[PDB]
């Protein structure tokens, strides 16, 4: 009892390289989050000064 | 290449660290953050020994978790000295951490300096501490029944919830058997003296505390008696057997006589050991060290019971429960020095392998709880749940204040500190008032995990305790809705809270503190 | 040079040349690579003329006996009590180096060293060894100092006892433990009372060793380090430290000829002979800390002071600290250099100037194709100025 | 997910894949020891690693011989061991009840 | 490169001297964002996870791996100033790297590296006498406040900072009561013989002074009391076990009736001697050596408290503080073996206390000595850690003030004072010894900046107002008073830090000061490197 | 001449043992079937305290193998000379045990010990004159550890008066090889010095530091079987307790190095108290841990006690 299998169904009929994301933690979360990254990469950059 | 420093070593510095730490730790938090409440799930974790752990303690899951951010090594640091020290709370104090510093963050990206957040923690965590002591209520300790709510109060979120009243009466008995008092110091030391046997198979509904302890264990000799009325107990360090001498005491036989007197002078020295054993007229024996067969034959002679090689902490136990002394010389050996207390000393069958009890003491002061069940992991757990109650109960004993739970306590906080910001005119009323805000991240947790609208049910009970006198109302974990501590009953021990509070926060300043981390760099 | 690891032989030659002069006079062991390399790189021009090598040696020793007449005509006598003259010598010598913002203290302390392990009316040289030095981190080099009496970095093994006025010290190169023949010996127990017979013993033993000791008033104890049995057992120095003894284990079998020079001890091997003319008088025997960056014990004061000296180095770093050393004990070869040979030479290159000019007139003088070879040597001897 | 941005070569198993995993591993356990209840079951043969021969019908044995590395098979093994350690009998049956219970959970 | 046929590789010139820089600055660079009451702590992972929060500029140069020598010596520089003072250890990296850039660049504007030596030994001098005439404060005109402002300004920036308000009532209180006059009079307080013991738990707030001493360490058996009261304490040098016979001594029997007898008595030897020591009345018995289970079960039935394994130096001060002898044997001048009771040590209660999950000792009010210990209560085991050293700095600050008298305003008070005096002196002192020295008086300028930075503060702006008050308190001898101004960095703006509290010890700055220029001329006297290749 | 017994447990003694087993045979002319394919008479000389002969001139050893997974000893089986030993002999579980103390010494693979100890009667029974037995494991490390020690502590208790001669593998100090081996060690060593009357510390590094000098992982199983046939191929111990040694070509108090490392080692982990929930949940007292600890000290300073 050393490996978690992966689950019956779409996790194992998943292609090799894929990713799957779902719910509010995967998903929306992490997108807010890459693009409050990106907001903050051109942050700096906005007005005059 | 002309270095200053080691390949290897990685220097980072600035809002990214700080982000990073905040991140990590709220993933800390985001792990456990569901086994909260009542109404919490089982996670089954697997161990690098190929073992299972099937818990809902927060502590137990970070601590089978393994990590490599220094943030999150310092949020499970923390979890582990919380468990330590109360022994609850272990999920609590991530979650408000993470919370903490999940505001914090809000402030930091906003200019405002590290330390100044800091010095606000520190005013919010002393009158957090005001306002706990202030709503927290005496118990007269007592009263049994109170004491057997405050247990059910903190094992209704585990397993064991199902057998509540069982595993209240047990934590209860083992605790105030535990109690003991020598030279004006109280001690309750139930890690060395309430000891915990997990037997698979059975019935759960069986488990019980023994007044007195429990061995795996059998008689040295099959002609000893297995069941003693009145037992008579001696407790030695020492071997019965002959052993060499610290020195090089090499023998010169040059008679013919000398050998055979050599191997009759050791069967005469084990005789007048075991004569200075029997001088007591003790009816059991029980030694951390091996036990010679022509000890045996002499106290089977005598008509005395011998159990050959115990462990120093059940001798310990077996001292504590039956009220003897360890010996280490036979010789040496006193009256006041002999077991007398226990009531029956019993050797039984269980499954295939032979168990040593000592029960039926009176005034014992350490006891052995023997778990039943299903399997080795739901002992486990429910070992676990127990050692938790025990030590609710101890924290009791200890301080008997209590304050209100299903978050009422962390509402109550929150509306004192929001109501005593307003007076606050300098830049650290909105890192304060944000800590208060933040504490509301309990219930908002407990209504997350019966299911409920946590919008709805978190604004009806931040209105409740707008209140005058409404520091006690909080909420269902099982439901969903608001009520009255004083009417359901969840209160939890004024330390436990206190030691909560206290972690989180001082985890908060900590990682607030660090920046510019550095690493690689080897020892 | 040494510290370089050079490869070509001819640079393995000039390390040992600069270690040569370092050797006789301590002073001048780049100057000397200096003038190798550049009488070398003038041999160049003088090879591709078409000259001999033999030529050209015998020419440069011809040169090299001119020279050394220049030299020694334009030296001055000096006498060793000119106290001025040795500082400003000193001084000379430390201001090429890292320690010449502190020359203010280390020519002084240069100076007087040497002038206290050498009879000045007679001495013709001076044994440096005679002179300690003993680096301690810590401080700054305005903190080096110049110790009378004795210092020592073993530590005191007493606790409570660090400082003793009038000071009676004995050089113990005997050992305070259980008695051991220098044959294989045993001691066979057949009895139980020999067992408290032999422990009963064993202390009578000791305790007469360490009685013998303080009757003759000694309260300052050096024991010699001592492999292959204990030199101050557990029981010895209990009963030391509760007669009130400092005692300092582990002193090396090399400092001992240095510590008995030192404070007039005489070592002792065998108890019998430890006696009161056996010891050194002492007005003060402290264990000094140096601000938590170490313990030193100094024996300062001594009714038989003879001829030898410590030097204290303090300083910030390792580095520092060395070249400190390195650099005054330049200054120590250069006040012996005075004491062999008692005359001066000015500095600032006007030796090597000197040469250079009259040189070149020895070689318009010696004309043929030894000239050559001389003023190449003169040319040579211009490149330290 | 959340503990895999901690510990980046962890595996997870979350609210539905848990007990899909879970119910799945139970399901398999009673499809194999299905066949050993009653006197009308049929023996398994077992041969180990080194080529030794087993022939048995019991819950347990067949369970600790079977090559499986299952977290909820290692579960409902060790509780058929407490089952058999202290009644002797009842580990296939044991068994089959677990994974008929998650079934009709399911 | 072929001429030279020395097996490595060699910088020259103004390669080697701006390599040197770079080396020192990297490492003033990782400590810089550490430096007062607005720095920020590190981390520090050792290659295998195990991490370290920090704001000691000395633990953090000690942690890291340097392999630069010209940072090296730095980080020496850095654990010299540890040992010495115990405070200071960024500020003398970052000022030792300031004056190695501007000598620097003095050297690449080609003033002769010995006379931006001279000028930086010039200036060092005159700074530590300006500093000595004008800018000390007597700690007798100024009481105990004093004390207490010197521990709470050590403990800004520390994680015991904001707590400073109780942390220097405690570090205060702490080496006043290990404070002991000996010889010669002088009063000495021996820092090091505080205890510090730390356990992660309760609050920082809940941290302990124990009027007395706490052992981390515990009883032997489980069935020896726990606490006593009118503990008479024996601590023994010795071990109390089954007595062997050494190795120069064999046992040969040749009578057998002999054996039971020896064998007894390699036991009875021990039983004798601790009945000796119990029969003065010894309760406590603390021990640096092993007792065995026999012995245990003796003094159990004894009801005394005996102590393994303890520690040489906890036994030296808990024998220092109770009164007692530590005995390294019982053998008197007779040639016997006894234990007098003058021997003992006293103390009004020995008690094993329970802190979180583990047990120490606690050994309250010996008499003979006071003594200190302080129990450190945080989160985990790095706050703890890091309470700890910052605990030892303020201890070391308030020795160092009770020791000499003298202490100096904060905030960068000193350092603006001393650059406008120095870049006045310098027009006196040579003509390019004078740009050194004017140089030196710039790079002192780096701490308030540094400071100011931190803070998240107008540096320039600020540190201008710093030095006109400084200016015309030099040149106004009415406002003599403002001497005493420095930063205020939770505003920033410049305020009298001699009534604000933020005092530092004289000797700090100094020390600071003086090991700052050694390193500095140490590393600028470096014009080549020879870098051997390893074998 | 008196029999000796040779237990051999874990992976690491499983396959010193093959091993010793091999060059031994080799030594007394026995093949892998057991056949005395030799002719000196010095060969059966002393060959009655190794093998335990049987009708038709087969020479089985006298030797049990041990671990709690049967893998390692079917891979004995099927290495060389891996069919002289009994078919009975082999003594295994179906659990792994993982690298557990607490899991090897207690309830965990506890019930095998007795079905060890039915193999050791069943091999001193054809001992006409028992002399001891030597057992060859790991200090710490899988199941050598925890089986190992209550191995030992089994072995003393059933049979209490002769030679218990260990061969443990002490744990190399540059190698960590585990993350619990500072509490395995301590742990075993705890019961080694009580249980055992002499102990050979053969140290994997120092071992490999030797295979290495020769040259100019079964490379170390065969530069340890020459070493444990110069051990008893053909005066020591003076104080029943310091009975541990360095073999070579030694009781030294280098010793005291390695100890001093595996205590330091375990009381900087035994500070935080890492991995220790799993000794504790699975049968271990918190107070197990001082007790290791304070012997080690001790084991320290009684070796401290000569220099
Ligand atoms: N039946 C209940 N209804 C609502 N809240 C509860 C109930 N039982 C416990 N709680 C609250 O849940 C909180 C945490 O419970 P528990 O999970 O035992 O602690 P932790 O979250 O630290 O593991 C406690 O503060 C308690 O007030
Ligand atoms: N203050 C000074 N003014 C001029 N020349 C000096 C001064 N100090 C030393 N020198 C010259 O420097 C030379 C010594 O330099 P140094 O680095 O010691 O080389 P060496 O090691 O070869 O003696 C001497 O020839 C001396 O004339
Ligand atoms: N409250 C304060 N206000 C302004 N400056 C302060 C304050 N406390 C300390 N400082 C300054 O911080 C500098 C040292 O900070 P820190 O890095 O904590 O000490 P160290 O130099 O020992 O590392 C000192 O030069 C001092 O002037
Ligand atoms: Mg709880
Ligand atoms: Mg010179
Ligand atoms: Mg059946
Ligand atoms: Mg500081």
């Known amino acids: 009892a050393l490996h978690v299998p992966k689950a019956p169904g779409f996790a194992q009929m998943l292609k090799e390289g894929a990713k799957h994301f779902s719910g509010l933690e995967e998903a929306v979360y992490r997108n807010i989050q890459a693009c409050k990254e990106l907001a903050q990469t051109t942050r700096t950059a906005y007005g005059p000064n | 290449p002309v270095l200053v420093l080691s390949q290897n070593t990685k220097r980072e510095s600035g809002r990214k660290v700080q982000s990073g730490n905040i991140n990590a730790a709220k993933t800390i938090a985001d792990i456990i953050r569901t086994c909260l409440g009542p109404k919490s799930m089982m996670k089954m974790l697997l161990d690098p020994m190929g073992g299972i752990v099937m818990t809902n303690d927060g502590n137990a899951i970070l601590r089978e978790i393994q990590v490599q951010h220094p943030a999150a090594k310092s949020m499970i640091e923390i979890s582990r000295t919380q468990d330590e020290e109360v022994g609850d709370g272990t999920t609590s104090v991530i979650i408000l951490a993470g919370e903490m510093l999940s505001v914090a963050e809000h402030f930091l990206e906003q200019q405002m ?155 005469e020295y084990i005789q007048q050991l075991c004569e200075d054993i029997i001088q007591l007229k003790p009816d059991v024996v029980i030694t951390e060290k091996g036990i010679s067969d022509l000890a045996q034959h002499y106290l089977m002679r005598a008509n005395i019971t011998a159990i050959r090689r115990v462990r120093k902490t059940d001798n310990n136990r077996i001292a504590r429960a039956c009220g003897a002394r360890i010996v280490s010389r036979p010789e040496e050996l006193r009256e006041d020095d002999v077991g007398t207390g226990a009531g029956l000393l019993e050797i039984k069958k269980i499954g295939d392998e032979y168990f040593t009890f000592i029960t039926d003491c009176k005034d014992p002061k350490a006891c052995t709880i023997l778990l039943r069940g299903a399997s080795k992991e739901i002992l486990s757990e429910v070992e676990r749940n127990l050692q938790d109650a025990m030590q609710v109960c101890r924290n009791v004993l200890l301080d008997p204040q209590l304050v209100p739970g299903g978050g009422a306590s962390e509402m109550a906080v929150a509306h004192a500190l929001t109501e005593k910001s307003k007076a606050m005119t300098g830049v650290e009323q909105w890192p304060y008032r944000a800590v208060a805000q933040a504490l509301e991240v309990i219930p908002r947790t407990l209504i997350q995990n019966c299911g409920a609208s946590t919008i709805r049910l978190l604004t009806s009970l931040r209105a409740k305790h707008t209140q005058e006198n409404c520091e006690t109302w909080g909420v269902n974990g099982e439901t969903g809705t608001l009520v009255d501590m004083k009417e359901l009953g969840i209160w939890e021990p004024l330390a436990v809270k206190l030691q909560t509070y206290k972690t989180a926060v001082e985890t908060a300043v900590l990682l607030l503190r660090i920046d510019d981390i550095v690493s690689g760099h080897k020892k | ?118 009879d000045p009316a007679t001495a013709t040289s001076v044994d440096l060894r005679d002179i300690k030095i003993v680096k301690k981190l810590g401080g700054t080099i305005d903190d080096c100092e110049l110790v009378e009496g004795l210092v020592l970095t073993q530590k005191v093994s007493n606790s409570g006892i660090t400082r003793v006025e009038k000071a009676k010290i004995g050089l113990i190169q005997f050992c305070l433990s259980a008695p051991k023949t220098d044959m294989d010996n045993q001691i066979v127990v057949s009895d139980y009372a020999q067992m408290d017979r032999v422990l009963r013993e064993e202390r009578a033993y000791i305790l007469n060793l360490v009685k013998q000791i303080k009757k003759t008033g000694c309260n300052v104890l050096l024991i010699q380090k001592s492999i292959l049995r204990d030199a101050l057992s557990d029981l010895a120095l209990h009963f030391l430290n509760k007669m009130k003894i400092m005692v300092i284990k582990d002193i090396e079998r090399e400092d001992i000829e240095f510590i008995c020079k030192t404070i007039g001890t005489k070592p002792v091997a065998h108890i019998d002979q430890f006696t009161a003319d056996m ?51 330049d200054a120590l070869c250069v006040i012996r250099c005075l004491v062999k040979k008692r005359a001066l030479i000015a500095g600032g290159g006007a030796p090597e100037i000197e040469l250079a000019l009259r040189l070149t007139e020895y070689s318009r003088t010696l004309s043929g194709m030894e000239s050559y070879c001389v003023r190449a040597f003169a040319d040579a001897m211009e490149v330290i100025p | 997910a959340a503990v895999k941005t901690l510990n980046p070569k962890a595996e997870v198993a979350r609210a539905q894949a848990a ?31 080194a080529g030794d021969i087993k022939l048995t019908k019991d819950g347990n044995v067949l369970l600790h011989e079977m090559q499986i590395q299952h977290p909820t098979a290692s579960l409902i093994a060790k509780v058929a061991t407490a089952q058999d350690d202290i009644t002797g009998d009842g580990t296939t049956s044991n068994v089959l009840i677990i994974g008929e219970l998650l079934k009709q959970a399911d | 490169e072929g001429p030279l046929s020395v097996f490595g590789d060699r910088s020259t010139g103004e390669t080697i001297r701006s390599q040197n820089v770079m080396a020192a600055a990297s490492i003033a660079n990782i400590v810089k964002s550490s430096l007062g009451p607005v720095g920020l702590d590190k981390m520090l992972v050792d290659d295998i996870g195990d991490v370290t929060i920090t704001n000691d500029g000395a633990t953090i140069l000690k942690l890291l791996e340097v392999e630069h020598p010209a940072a090296k010596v730095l980080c020496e520089l850095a654990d010299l100033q540890d040992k010495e003072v115990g405070d200071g250890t960024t500020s003398v990296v970052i000022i030792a790297a300031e004056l190695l850039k501007n000598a620097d660049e003095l050297v690449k504007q080609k003033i002769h590296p010995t006379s931006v030596i001279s000028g930086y030994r010039l200036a060092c001098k005159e700074a530590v006498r300006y500093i000595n005439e004008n800018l000390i404060v007597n700690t007798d005109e100024l009481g105990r406040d004093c004390l207490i402002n010197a521990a709470k300004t050590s403990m800004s920036s520390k994680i015991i900072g904001i707590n400073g308000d109780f942390f220097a009532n405690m570090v205060v209180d702490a080496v006043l009561a290990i404070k002991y006059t ?30 007395g001493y706490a052992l981390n360490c515990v009883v032997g058996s489980q069935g020896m009391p726990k606490r006593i009261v009118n503990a008479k304490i024996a601590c023994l040098d010795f071990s109390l076990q089954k007595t062997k016979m050494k190795l120069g001594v064999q046992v040969v029997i040749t009578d057998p009736e002999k054996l039971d007898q020896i064998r007894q008595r390699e036991s009875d030897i021990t039983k004798e001697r601790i009945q000796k020591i119990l029969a003065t009345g010894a309760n406590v018995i603390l021990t640096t050596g092993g007792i065995d289970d026999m012995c245990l079960k003796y003094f159990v039935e004894a009801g005394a408290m005996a102590v ?228 | 001449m008196r029999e000796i017994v040779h237990i051999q447990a874990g992976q690491c003694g499983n396959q010193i043992g093959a091993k010793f087993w091999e060059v031994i045979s080799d030594e007394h002319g026995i093949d892998p079937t057991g056949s005395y394919h030799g002719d000196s008479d010095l060969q059966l000389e002393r060959i009655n305290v190794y093998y335990n002969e049987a009708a038709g001139n087969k020479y089985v050893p006298r030797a049990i193998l041990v671990d709690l997974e049967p893998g390692t000893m079917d891979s004995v089986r099927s290495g060389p000379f891996g069919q002289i030993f009994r078919p009975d002999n082999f003594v295994f579980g179906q659990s792994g045990a993982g690298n557990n103390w607490a899991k090897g010494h207690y309830t965990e693979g506890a019930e095998l010990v007795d079905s060890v100890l039915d193999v ?112 008893t191929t053909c005066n020591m111990v003076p104080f029943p307790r310091l009975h541990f040694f360095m073999p070579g070509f030694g009781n030294s108090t280098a010793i005291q190095e390695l100890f001093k490392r595996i205590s330091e080692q375990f009381t900087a982990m035994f500070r935080r108290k890492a991995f220790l929930h799993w000794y504790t949940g699975e049968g271990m007292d918190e107070m197990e841990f001082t007790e290791a600890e304070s012997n080690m000290n001790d084991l320290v300073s009684e070796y401290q006690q000569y220099q």
Request: hydrophobic share 40%; with cysteine.
């Open chain 2, 113 to 267: 300096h590290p330390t100044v957040v800091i010095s606000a923690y520190r005013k919010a965590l002393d009158d957090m501490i005001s306002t706990l002591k202030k709503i927290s209520i005496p118990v007269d300790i007592s009263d049994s029944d109170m004491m057997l709510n405050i247990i059910n109060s903190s094992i209704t979120t585990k397993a064991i919830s199902r057998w509540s009243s069982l595993a209240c009466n047990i934590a209860l008995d083992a605790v105030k058997m535990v109690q003991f008092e020598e030279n004006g110091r109280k001690e309750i030391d139930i890690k060395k003296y309430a000891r915990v046997e997990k037997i698979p198979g059975g019935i759960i509904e069986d488990s019980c505390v023994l007044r007195g302890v429990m061995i795996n264990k059998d008689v040295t000799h099959p002609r000893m008696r297995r069941y003693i009325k009145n037992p008579r107990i001696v407790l030695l360090d020492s071997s019965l057997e002959y052993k060499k001498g610290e020195s090089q005491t090499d023998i010169e036989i040059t008679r013919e006589e000398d050998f055979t007197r050599i191997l009759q002078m050791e069967e």
């Open chain 3, 1 to 118: 040079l040494k510290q370089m690891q050079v490869l070509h032989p001819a640079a393995r030659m000039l390390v040992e040349l600069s270690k040569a002069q370092d050797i006789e006079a301590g002073d001048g062991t780049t100057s000397v690579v200096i003038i190798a390399g550049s009488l070398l790189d003038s041999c160049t021009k003088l090879l591709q003329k078409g000259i001999h090598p033999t030529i050209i040696s015998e020419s440069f020793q011809k040169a090299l006996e001119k020279g050394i007449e220049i030299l020694t005509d334009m030296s001055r006598p000096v006498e060793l009590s000119d106290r001025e003259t040795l500082l400003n010598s000193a001084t000379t010598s430390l201001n090429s180096k890292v320690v010449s913002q502190y020359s203010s203290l280390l020519s002084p302390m240069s100076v007087n060293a040497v002038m206290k392990v050498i």
């Open chain 3, 279 to 329: 010891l050194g008088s002492a007005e003060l025997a402290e264990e000094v800390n140096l601000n938590g960056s170490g313990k030193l014990l100094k024996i300062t004061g001594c009714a038989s002071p003879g001829k030898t000296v410590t030097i204290v180095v303090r300083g910030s770093n390792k580095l520092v600290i060395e070249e400190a050393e390195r650099s005054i004990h």
């Open chain 4, 19 to 49: 007990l899909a995993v879970n119910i799945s591993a139970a399901r398999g356990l009673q499809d194999v020891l299905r066949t050993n209840l009653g006197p009308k079951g049929t023996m398994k043969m077992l041969v180990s690693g």
């Open chain 5, 182 to 211: 000996d010889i010669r009079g002088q009063p000495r307080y021996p820092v090091n013989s505080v205890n510090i013991l730390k356990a992660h738990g309760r609050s920082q707030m809940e941290s302990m002074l124990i009027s």
């Open chain 5, 308 to 535: 393994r394994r303890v520690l040489k130096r906890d036994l030296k001060r808990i024998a220092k503080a109770s009164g007692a002898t530590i005995l390294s044997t019982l053998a008197n001048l007779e040639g016997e073996e006894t234990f007098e009771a003058a021997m003992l040590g006293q103390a009004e209660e020995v008690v094993q206390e329970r802190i979180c999950d583990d047990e120490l000792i606690l050994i309250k009010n010996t008499k003979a000595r006071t003594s200190a210990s302080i129990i450190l209560r945080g989160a985990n085991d790095f706050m703890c850690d890091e309470m700890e050293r910052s605990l030892h700095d303020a201890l070391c600050v308030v020795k160092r003030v009770l020791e000499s008298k003298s202490v100096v305003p904060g905030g960068g008070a000193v350092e603006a004072a001393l650059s406008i005096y120095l870049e006045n002196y310098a027009t006196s002192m040579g003509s390019r010894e004078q740009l050194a020295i004017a140089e030196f008086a710039r790079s002192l300028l780096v701490i308030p900046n540094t400071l100011a930075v931190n803070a998240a503060q107008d540096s320039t702006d600020l540190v201008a107002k710093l030095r006109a008050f400084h200016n015309e308190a030099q040149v106004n001898p009415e406002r003599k008073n403002l001497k005493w101004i420095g930063l205020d960095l939770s505003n920033g703006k410049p305020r009298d830090n001699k009534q604000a509290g933020v005092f530092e010890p004289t000797i700090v700055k100094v020390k600071s000061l003086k090991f700052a220029t050694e390193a500095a001329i140490t590393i600028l006297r470096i014009d080549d490197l020879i870098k051997l290749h390893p074998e």
């Open chain 6, 120 to 231: 050791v009667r069943k091999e001193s029974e054809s001992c006409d004159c028992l002399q001891g037995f030597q057992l060859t494991h790991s200090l710490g490390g899988g199941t050598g550890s925890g089986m190992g020690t209550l191995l030992i502590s089994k072995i003393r208790e059933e049979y209490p008066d002769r030679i218990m001669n260990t061969f443990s593998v002490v744990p190399s100090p540059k190698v960590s090889d585990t993350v619990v081996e500072p509490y395995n060690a301590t742990l075993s060593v705890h019961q080694l010095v009580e249980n055992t009357d002499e102990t050979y510390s053969i140290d994997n590094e120092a071992l490999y530091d030797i295979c290495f000098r020769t040259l100019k992982y079964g490379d170390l199983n065969h530069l340890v079987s020459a070493t444990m046939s110069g051990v």
